[PDB]
Amino acid sequence: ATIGRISTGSKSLDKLLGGGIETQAITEVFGEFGSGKTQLAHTLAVMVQLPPEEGGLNGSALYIDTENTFRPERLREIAQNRGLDPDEVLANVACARAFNSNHQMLLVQQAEDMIKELLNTDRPVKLLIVDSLTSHFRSEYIGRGALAERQQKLAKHLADLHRLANLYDIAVFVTNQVSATLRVYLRKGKGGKRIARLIDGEAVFSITEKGIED
Ligand SMILES: O=C(O)c1ccc2c(c1)CCCC2
């Protein structure tokens, strides 16, 4: 399969990314609490549904929510302001709440069953989001030998996500509060602006009724 790209909604962020986030890849966005990582996650869940001429892949999206950050009303607002039908945008985004890190790891196996079901239909899964991927791993693995166990567990989780990305031609997008194909550092700036830098030029964008934009 040819590498597809999903537009982030910001032309500036898209140019930094080579046209958007790639399928058969894991893109990780990291930053401090309140930098806009979840906003980007929400905008991509809408953008993936658009035709390629509009920056999408005619795809559906899976959203693994670890900290209760999924807002369907936000997807609706983003869809309405991008000239999409809000009810239809919601019907193409499936959300699952991860209750702890072990549950989060099992949800990746369940995502594979949903990907298989939709494979070769008119709306195949083209995006899998894991919001605050490390949140549960950081709060649960405190102690002596807990740190080596945290590392073994995340390594296995990340390898399961890499496997899905390549096998089913999906863009995996993960957020992390301070392994990936691409790492993007996100920070707040002056005048409510958000700044993105590739880790290993800078994009500048705003958080608006259109999700994220120039
Ligand atoms: O509703 C469910 O049973 C369910 C289970 C797993 C996953 C989703 C939904 C959506 C995101 C991917 C992981």
Coordinates of N, CA and C and ligand atoms in Angstrom, one line a residue:
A1 N 0.8 -1.2 0.0 CA 0.0 0.0 0.0 C 0.9 1.3 0.0
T2 N 0.4 2.3 -0.7 CA 1.0 3.6 -0.8 C 0.7 4.4 0.5
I3 N 1.7 5.1 1.0 CA 1.6 5.9 2.2 C 0.6 7.1 2.0
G4 N -0.5 7.0 2.8 CA -1.5 8.1 2.8 C -1.1 9.1 3.8
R5 N -1.7 10.3 3.7 CA -1.5 11.4 4.6 C -2.7 12.0 5.0
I6 N -2.9 12.4 6.3 CA -4.1 13.0 6.8 C -3.7 14.4 7.2
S7 N -4.4 15.4 6.7 CA -4.1 16.8 7.0 C -4.5 17.0 8.5
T8 N -3.7 17.9 9.2 CA -3.9 18.2 10.6 C -4.9 19.3 10.8
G9 N -5.2 20.0 9.7 CA -6.2 21.1 9.7 C -5.4 22.5 9.6
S10 N -4.1 22.5 9.9 CA -3.3 23.6 9.8 C -2.3 23.4 8.7
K11 N -2.2 24.4 7.7 CA -1.3 24.3 6.6 C 0.1 24.4 7.0
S12 N 0.4 25.2 8.1 CA 1.7 25.3 8.6 C 2.2 24.0 9.3
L13 N 1.3 23.3 10.1 CA 1.6 22.0 10.7 C 1.8 21.0 9.6
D14 N 0.9 21.0 8.5 CA 1.0 20.1 7.4 C 2.3 20.2 6.7
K15 N 2.8 21.4 6.4 CA 4.1 21.6 5.7 C 5.3 21.0 6.6
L16 N 5.2 21.2 7.9 CA 6.2 20.7 8.8 C 6.3 19.1 8.7
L17 N 5.1 18.6 8.6 CA 4.9 17.1 8.5 C 5.0 16.5 7.1
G18 N 5.3 17.3 6.1 CA 5.4 16.7 4.7 C 4.0 16.5 4.0
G19 N 3.0 17.1 4.6 CA 1.6 17.1 4.1 C 0.5 16.5 5.0
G20 N 1.0 16.1 6.2 CA 0.1 15.6 7.3 C 0.7 14.3 7.9
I21 N -0.1 13.7 8.8 CA 0.4 12.5 9.5 C 0.3 11.3 8.5
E22 N 1.3 10.4 8.6 CA 1.4 9.3 7.6 C 0.7 8.0 8.1
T23 N 0.1 7.3 7.2 CA -0.4 5.9 7.4 C 0.9 5.1 7.5
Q24 N 0.8 3.8 8.1 CA 1.9 2.9 8.3 C 3.0 3.6 9.1
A25 N 2.5 4.4 10.1 CA 3.4 5.1 10.9 C 2.8 5.5 12.3
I26 N 3.6 5.7 13.3 CA 3.2 6.1 14.6 C 3.7 7.6 14.7
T27 N 2.7 8.5 14.9 CA 3.1 9.9 15.1 C 2.8 10.1 16.5
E28 N 3.8 10.6 17.3 CA 3.7 11.0 18.7 C 3.8 12.5 18.8
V29 N 2.7 13.1 19.5 CA 2.8 14.5 19.8 C 2.9 14.6 21.4
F30 N 4.0 15.3 21.8 CA 4.2 15.4 23.3 C 4.3 16.9 23.7
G31 N 3.9 17.1 24.9 CA 4.0 18.5 25.5 C 3.4 18.6 26.8
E32 N 3.4 19.8 27.4 CA 2.9 20.0 28.7 C 1.4 20.0 28.7
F33 N 0.8 19.8 29.8 CA -0.7 19.9 30.0 C -1.2 21.2 29.4
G34 N -2.2 21.2 28.6 CA -2.7 22.4 28.0 C -2.1 22.9 26.7
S35 N -1.2 22.1 26.1 CA -0.6 22.5 24.8 C -1.4 22.3 23.5
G36 N -2.5 21.5 23.6 CA -3.3 21.3 22.4 C -3.3 19.9 21.7
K37 N -2.6 19.0 22.4 CA -2.4 17.6 21.9 C -3.8 16.9 21.6
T38 N -4.7 17.0 22.5 CA -6.1 16.5 22.4 C -6.9 17.2 21.3
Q39 N -6.7 18.5 21.2 CA -7.3 19.3 20.1 C -6.9 18.8 18.8
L40 N -5.6 18.5 18.6 CA -5.0 17.9 17.4 C -5.7 16.6 17.1
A41 N -5.7 15.7 18.1 CA -6.3 14.4 18.1 C -7.8 14.5 17.6
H42 N -8.6 15.4 18.2 CA -9.9 15.6 17.8 C -10.1 16.1 16.3
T43 N -9.2 17.0 15.9 CA -9.2 17.6 14.5 C -8.9 16.5 13.5
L44 N -7.9 15.6 13.8 CA -7.5 14.5 12.8 C -8.7 13.5 12.7
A45 N -9.5 13.3 13.8 CA -10.6 12.3 13.7 C -11.7 12.7 12.8
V46 N -11.8 14.0 12.5 CA -12.7 14.7 11.5 C -12.0 14.7 10.2
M47 N -10.7 15.2 10.0 CA -10.0 15.3 8.8 C -9.8 14.0 8.1
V48 N -9.6 12.9 8.8 CA -9.5 11.6 8.1 C -10.7 11.2 7.2
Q49 N -11.9 11.7 7.5 CA -13.1 11.4 6.9 C -13.3 12.1 5.5
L50 N -12.6 13.1 5.3 CA -12.6 14.0 4.1 C -12.1 13.2 2.9
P51 N -12.4 13.6 1.7 CA -11.8 12.9 0.5 C -10.3 13.4 0.4
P52 N -9.4 12.6 -0.3 CA -8.0 13.0 -0.5 C -7.8 14.5 -1.0
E53 N -8.6 15.0 -1.9 CA -8.5 16.3 -2.4 C -8.7 17.4 -1.3
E54 N -9.4 17.0 -0.2 CA -9.6 17.8 1.0 C -8.7 17.5 2.2
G55 N -7.8 16.6 2.0 CA -6.8 16.3 3.0 C -7.1 15.0 3.8
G56 N -8.2 14.3 3.5 CA -8.5 13.1 4.2 C -8.2 11.8 3.4
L57 N -8.7 10.7 3.9 CA -8.5 9.4 3.3 C -9.8 8.6 3.2
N58 N -11.0 9.3 3.3 CA -12.3 8.6 3.2 C -12.4 7.5 4.3
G59 N -11.8 7.8 5.4 CA -11.7 6.8 6.5 C -12.5 7.0 7.7
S60 N -12.5 6.0 8.5 CA -13.1 6.1 9.9 C -12.0 6.1 10.9
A61 N -12.4 6.5 12.1 CA -11.3 6.6 13.2 C -11.6 5.8 14.5
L62 N -10.6 5.4 15.1 CA -10.7 4.7 16.4 C -10.1 5.6 17.4
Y63 N -10.7 5.8 18.6 CA -10.1 6.6 19.6 C -10.0 5.9 21.0
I64 N -8.8 5.6 21.5 CA -8.6 5.0 22.8 C -8.3 6.2 23.7
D65 N -9.3 6.4 24.6 CA -9.3 7.5 25.6 C -8.9 7.0 26.9
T66 N -7.8 7.4 27.5 CA -7.3 7.0 28.8 C -7.6 7.9 29.9
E67 N -7.9 9.2 29.7 CA -8.2 10.2 30.7 C -9.5 10.9 30.7
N68 N -10.5 10.3 29.9 CA -11.8 10.9 29.7 C -11.7 12.3 29.1
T69 N -11.1 12.4 27.9 CA -10.8 13.6 27.1 C -11.6 13.7 25.8
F70 N -12.3 12.5 25.4 CA -13.1 12.5 24.2 C -14.3 13.3 24.4
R71 N -14.5 14.3 23.5 CA -15.7 15.1 23.5 C -16.4 15.1 22.2
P72 N -17.5 14.3 22.1 CA -18.3 14.2 20.8 C -18.8 15.6 20.3
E73 N -19.2 16.4 21.2 CA -19.6 17.8 20.9 C -18.5 18.6 20.3
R74 N -17.3 18.3 20.6 CA -16.1 19.0 20.0 C -15.9 18.5 18.6
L75 N -16.1 17.2 18.3 CA -16.1 16.6 17.0 C -17.1 17.3 16.1
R76 N -18.3 17.5 16.7 CA -19.5 18.1 16.0 C -19.2 19.5 15.6
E77 N -18.6 20.3 16.5 CA -18.3 21.7 16.2 C -17.2 21.7 15.1
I78 N -16.2 20.9 15.2 CA -15.1 20.9 14.2 C -15.7 20.5 12.8
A79 N -16.6 19.5 12.8 CA -17.2 19.0 11.5 C -18.1 20.1 10.9
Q80 N -18.9 20.8 11.7 CA -19.8 21.9 11.3 C -19.0 23.0 10.6
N81 N -17.9 23.4 11.3 CA -17.1 24.5 10.8 C -16.2 24.1 9.6
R82 N -16.1 22.8 9.3 CA -15.3 22.3 8.1 C -16.3 21.9 7.0
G83 N -17.5 22.2 7.1 CA -18.6 21.9 6.1 C -19.0 20.5 6.0
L84 N -18.8 19.7 7.1 CA -19.1 18.3 7.2 C -20.4 18.1 8.0
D85 N -21.1 16.9 7.8 CA -22.3 16.6 8.6 C -21.8 16.2 10.0
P86 N -22.2 16.9 11.1 CA -21.8 16.5 12.4 C -22.2 15.1 12.9
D87 N -23.5 14.7 12.6 CA -24.0 13.4 13.0 C -23.1 12.3 12.3
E88 N -22.9 12.4 11.0 CA -22.1 11.5 10.3 C -20.7 11.4 10.7
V89 N -20.1 12.5 11.1 CA -18.7 12.5 11.6 C -18.6 11.7 12.9
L90 N -19.6 11.8 13.8 CA -19.7 11.0 15.0 C -19.8 9.6 14.8
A91 N -20.6 9.2 13.8 CA -20.9 7.8 13.4 C -19.6 7.1 12.9
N92 N -18.6 7.9 12.4 CA -17.4 7.4 11.9 C -16.2 7.4 12.9
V93 N -16.5 7.7 14.2 CA -15.5 7.7 15.2 C -15.9 6.8 16.3
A94 N -15.2 5.8 16.6 CA -15.5 4.9 17.7 C -14.6 5.1 18.9
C95 N -15.1 5.4 20.1 CA -14.3 5.7 21.3 C -14.4 4.5 22.3
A96 N -13.3 4.2 22.9 CA -13.3 3.2 24.0 C -12.5 3.8 25.2
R97 N -13.0 3.7 26.4 CA -12.3 4.2 27.5 C -11.3 3.1 28.1
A98 N -10.0 3.5 28.3 CA -9.1 2.5 28.8 C -9.1 2.8 30.4
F99 N -9.4 1.7 31.2 CA -9.5 1.8 32.6 C -8.2 1.7 33.4
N100 N -7.2 1.1 32.8 CA -5.9 1.0 33.4 C -4.9 0.6 32.2
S101 N -3.6 0.5 32.5 CA -2.6 0.2 31.4 C -2.8 -1.2 30.8
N102 N -3.2 -2.2 31.7 CA -3.4 -3.5 31.1 C -4.6 -3.6 30.2
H103 N -5.7 -2.9 30.6 CA -6.9 -2.8 29.8 C -6.6 -2.0 28.5
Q104 N -5.8 -1.0 28.6 CA -5.3 -0.2 27.4 C -4.6 -1.1 26.5
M105 N -3.8 -2.0 27.0 CA -3.1 -3.0 26.1 C -4.0 -4.0 25.4
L106 N -5.1 -4.4 26.1 CA -6.1 -5.3 25.6 C -7.0 -4.6 24.5
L107 N -7.3 -3.3 24.7 CA -8.1 -2.5 23.8 C -7.4 -2.5 22.3
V108 N -6.1 -2.5 22.3 CA -5.4 -2.5 21.0 C -5.8 -3.8 20.2
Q109 N -5.9 -5.0 20.9 CA -6.3 -6.2 20.3 C -7.7 -6.1 19.8
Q110 N -8.6 -5.5 20.6 CA -10.0 -5.2 20.2 C -10.1 -4.3 19.0
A111 N -9.2 -3.3 18.9 CA -9.1 -2.3 17.8 C -8.8 -3.1 16.5
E112 N -7.9 -4.1 16.6 CA -7.6 -5.0 15.4 C -8.9 -5.7 14.8
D113 N -9.8 -6.2 15.7 CA -11.1 -6.8 15.3 C -11.9 -5.8 14.5
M114 N -12.0 -4.6 15.0 CA -12.8 -3.5 14.4 C -12.2 -3.1 13.0
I115 N -10.8 -3.0 12.9 CA -10.1 -2.7 11.7 C -10.4 -3.8 10.7
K116 N -10.3 -5.1 11.0 CA -10.6 -6.2 10.2 C -12.0 -6.1 9.6
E117 N -13.0 -5.8 10.4 CA -14.4 -5.7 10.0 C -14.6 -4.7 8.9
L118 N -13.9 -3.5 9.1 CA -14.1 -2.4 8.2 C -13.1 -2.3 7.0
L119 N -12.2 -3.3 7.0 CA -11.2 -3.4 5.9 C -11.8 -3.6 4.6
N120 N -11.5 -2.9 3.6 CA -12.0 -2.9 2.2 C -13.5 -2.5 2.0
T121 N -14.1 -1.8 3.1 CA -15.4 -1.2 2.9 C -15.2 0.2 2.4
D122 N -16.3 1.0 2.3 CA -16.1 2.4 1.9 C -15.6 3.3 3.0
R123 N -15.6 2.9 4.3 CA -15.0 3.7 5.3 C -14.0 2.9 6.2
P124 N -12.9 2.4 5.6 CA -12.0 1.6 6.5 C -11.3 2.4 7.6
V125 N -10.9 1.7 8.6 CA -10.2 2.5 9.7 C -8.9 3.0 9.1
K126 N -8.7 4.3 9.2 CA -7.5 4.9 8.7 C -6.7 5.7 9.7
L127 N -7.3 5.8 10.9 CA -6.7 6.5 12.1 C -7.0 5.8 13.4
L128 N -6.0 5.6 14.2 CA -6.2 5.1 15.5 C -5.4 6.0 16.4
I129 N -6.2 6.6 17.3 CA -5.6 7.6 18.3 C -5.6 6.9 19.7
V130 N -4.5 7.1 20.4 CA -4.3 6.7 21.8 C -3.9 8.0 22.5
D131 N -4.9 8.6 23.3 CA -4.7 9.8 23.9 C -4.0 9.7 25.3
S132 N -2.9 10.4 25.6 CA -2.2 10.3 26.8 C -1.8 8.8 27.0
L133 N -1.1 8.2 26.0 CA -0.7 6.8 26.0 C 0.0 6.4 27.2
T134 N 0.8 7.2 27.8 CA 1.7 6.9 29.0 C 1.1 7.2 30.3
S135 N -0.1 7.9 30.4 CA -0.8 8.3 31.6 C -1.0 7.2 32.6
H136 N -1.6 6.1 32.2 CA -1.8 4.9 33.2 C -0.5 4.2 33.6
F137 N 0.4 4.1 32.6 CA 1.7 3.5 32.9 C 2.5 4.3 33.9
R138 N 2.5 5.6 33.8 CA 3.2 6.4 34.8 C 2.6 6.4 36.2
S139 N 1.2 6.4 36.3 CA 0.6 6.4 37.6 C 0.6 5.0 38.3
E140 N 0.6 3.9 37.5 CA 0.6 2.6 38.1 C 2.0 2.0 38.5
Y141 N 3.0 2.3 37.7 CA 4.3 1.7 37.9 C 5.2 2.6 38.7
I142 N 5.0 2.7 40.0 CA 5.8 3.4 41.1 C 6.2 2.3 42.0
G143 N 7.5 2.3 42.3 CA 8.2 1.4 43.2 C 9.6 1.1 42.8
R144 N 10.2 0.0 43.4 CA 11.5 -0.4 43.1 C 11.7 -0.9 41.7
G145 N 11.2 -2.2 41.5 CA 11.3 -2.9 40.2 C 10.2 -2.5 39.2
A146 N 9.3 -1.6 39.6 CA 8.2 -1.1 38.8 C 8.6 -0.3 37.6
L147 N 9.8 0.4 37.6 CA 10.3 1.1 36.4 C 10.7 0.3 35.3
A148 N 11.4 -0.9 35.6 CA 11.8 -1.8 34.6 C 10.6 -2.5 34.0
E149 N 9.6 -2.8 34.8 CA 8.3 -3.4 34.3 C 7.5 -2.4 33.5
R150 N 7.5 -1.1 33.8 CA 6.8 -0.1 33.1 C 7.4 -0.1 31.6
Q151 N 8.7 -0.1 31.5 CA 9.5 -0.1 30.3 C 9.2 -1.3 29.4
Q152 N 9.1 -2.5 30.0 CA 8.8 -3.8 29.2 C 7.4 -3.7 28.7
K153 N 6.4 -3.2 29.5 CA 5.0 -3.1 29.2 C 4.8 -2.1 28.1
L154 N 5.4 -0.9 28.1 CA 5.2 0.1 27.1 C 5.8 -0.4 25.8
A155 N 7.0 -1.0 25.9 CA 7.7 -1.6 24.6 C 6.7 -2.5 23.9
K156 N 6.0 -3.4 24.6 CA 5.1 -4.4 24.0 C 3.9 -3.6 23.4
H157 N 3.4 -2.7 24.2 CA 2.2 -1.8 23.7 C 2.6 -1.1 22.4
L158 N 3.7 -0.4 22.4 CA 4.2 0.3 21.2 C 4.4 -0.6 20.0
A159 N 4.9 -1.8 20.2 CA 5.2 -2.8 19.1 C 3.8 -3.3 18.6
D160 N 2.8 -3.5 19.4 CA 1.4 -3.9 19.0 C 0.9 -2.8 18.1
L161 N 1.0 -1.5 18.5 CA 0.6 -0.3 17.6 C 1.3 -0.3 16.3
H162 N 2.6 -0.5 16.3 CA 3.4 -0.5 15.1 C 2.9 -1.6 14.1
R163 N 2.7 -2.8 14.7 CA 2.1 -3.9 13.9 C 0.8 -3.5 13.2
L164 N -0.1 -2.9 13.9 CA -1.4 -2.5 13.3 C -1.2 -1.4 12.2
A165 N -0.3 -0.5 12.5 CA 0.0 0.6 11.5 C 0.4 0.1 10.2
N166 N 1.4 -0.8 10.2 CA 1.9 -1.5 9.0 C 1.0 -2.5 8.3
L167 N 0.4 -3.4 9.1 CA -0.4 -4.4 8.6 C -1.7 -3.9 7.9
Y168 N -2.4 -2.9 8.5 CA -3.7 -2.4 8.0 C -3.6 -1.0 7.4
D169 N -2.4 -0.5 7.1 CA -2.3 0.8 6.5 C -3.1 1.9 7.2
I170 N -2.8 2.1 8.5 CA -3.5 3.1 9.4 C -2.4 4.0 9.9
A171 N -2.9 5.3 10.2 CA -2.0 6.3 10.8 C -2.3 6.1 12.3
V172 N -1.3 5.8 13.1 CA -1.5 5.7 14.5 C -1.0 7.1 15.1
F173 N -1.9 7.7 15.9 CA -1.5 9.1 16.4 C -1.6 8.9 17.9
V174 N -0.5 9.1 18.6 CA -0.5 9.0 20.1 C -0.1 10.3 20.8
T175 N -0.7 10.7 21.9 CA -0.4 11.9 22.6 C 0.3 11.5 24.0
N176 N 1.2 12.4 24.4 CA 2.0 12.1 25.6 C 2.3 13.3 26.4
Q177 N 1.9 13.4 27.7 CA 2.2 14.5 28.6 C 3.6 14.4 29.1
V178 N 4.5 15.3 28.5 CA 5.9 15.4 28.7 C 6.6 14.1 29.1
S179 N 10.9 5.1 19.7 CA 9.9 4.1 19.2 C 9.0 4.7 18.1
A180 N 8.4 5.9 18.3 CA 7.5 6.5 17.3 C 8.2 6.6 15.9
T181 N 7.4 6.6 14.8 CA 8.0 6.9 13.5 C 8.4 8.4 13.5
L182 N 7.6 9.3 14.1 CA 7.8 10.7 14.1 C 7.4 11.3 15.4
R183 N 8.3 12.2 16.0 CA 8.0 12.8 17.3 C 7.8 14.3 17.1
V184 N 6.7 14.9 17.6 CA 6.4 16.3 17.5 C 6.2 16.9 18.8
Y185 N 7.1 17.9 19.1 CA 7.0 18.6 20.4 C 6.0 19.8 20.2
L186 N 5.0 19.9 21.1 CA 4.0 21.0 21.0 C 4.0 21.9 22.3
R187 N 4.1 23.2 22.1 CA 4.1 24.1 23.3 C 3.2 25.3 23.0
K188 N 2.7 25.9 24.1 CA 1.9 27.1 24.0 C 2.9 28.3 23.7
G189 N 2.4 29.3 23.1 CA 3.2 30.5 22.8 C 2.5 31.7 23.2
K190 N 3.0 32.9 22.7 CA 2.4 34.2 23.0 C 1.1 34.3 22.1
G191 N 0.1 35.0 22.7 CA -1.2 35.3 22.0 C -2.1 34.1 21.7
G192 N -2.0 33.0 22.5 CA -2.7 31.8 22.4 C -2.2 30.9 21.3
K193 N -1.1 31.2 20.7 CA -0.6 30.4 19.5 C 0.0 29.1 20.0
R194 N 0.0 28.1 19.2 CA 0.6 26.8 19.5 C 1.8 26.6 18.6
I195 N 2.9 26.1 19.0 CA 4.1 25.9 18.3 C 4.5 24.5 18.3
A196 N 4.8 24.0 17.1 CA 5.2 22.6 16.8 C 6.6 22.5 16.2
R197 N 7.4 21.6 16.8 CA 8.8 21.4 16.3 C 9.0 19.8 16.2
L198 N 9.7 19.4 15.1 CA 10.0 18.0 14.9 C 11.2 17.7 15.8
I199 N 11.1 16.6 16.6 CA 12.2 16.2 17.5 C 13.0 15.1 16.7
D200 N 14.3 15.3 16.5 CA 15.3 14.4 15.9 C 15.1 14.4 14.3
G201 N 12.7 24.0 11.2 CA 11.6 25.0 11.1 C 10.5 24.7 12.1
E202 N 9.6 25.6 12.3 CA 8.5 25.4 13.3 C 7.2 25.8 12.7
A203 N 6.1 25.1 13.0 CA 4.8 25.4 12.6 C 4.1 26.2 13.7
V204 N 3.3 27.1 13.3 CA 2.5 27.9 14.3 C 1.1 27.8 13.9
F205 N 0.2 27.6 14.9 CA -1.3 27.5 14.6 C -2.1 27.9 15.8
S206 N -3.4 27.9 15.7 CA -4.3 28.3 16.7 C -5.4 27.2 17.0
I207 N -6.0 27.2 18.1 CA -7.1 26.3 18.5 C -8.3 27.1 18.3
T208 N -9.2 26.7 17.3 CA -10.4 27.4 17.0 C -11.6 26.5 16.9
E209 N -12.7 27.1 16.4 CA -14.0 26.4 16.1 C -13.8 25.3 15.0
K210 N -12.7 25.4 14.3 CA -12.3 24.5 13.2 C -11.3 23.5 13.7
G211 N -11.1 23.5 15.0 CA -10.3 22.5 15.7 C -8.9 23.2 15.9
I212 N -8.0 22.9 14.9 CA -6.7 23.6 14.8 C -6.7 24.2 13.4
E213 N -6.0 25.4 13.2 CA -5.8 26.0 11.9 C -4.8 27.1 12.0
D214 N -4.3 27.6 10.8 CA -3.3 28.7 10.7 C -3.8 30.1 11.2
Ligands
LIG1 O1 -17.2 -0.3 22.1 C1 -16.4 -1.2 22.2 O2 -16.6 -2.3 22.6 C2 -14.9 -0.8 21.7 C3 -13.9 -1.7 22.1 C4 -12.6 -1.4 21.7 C5 -12.3 -0.2 21.0 C6 -13.3 0.6 20.6 C7 -14.7 0.3 21.0 C8 -13.1 1.9 19.9 C9 -11.6 2.3 19.9 C10 -10.7 1.2 19.6 C11 -10.8 0.1 20.7

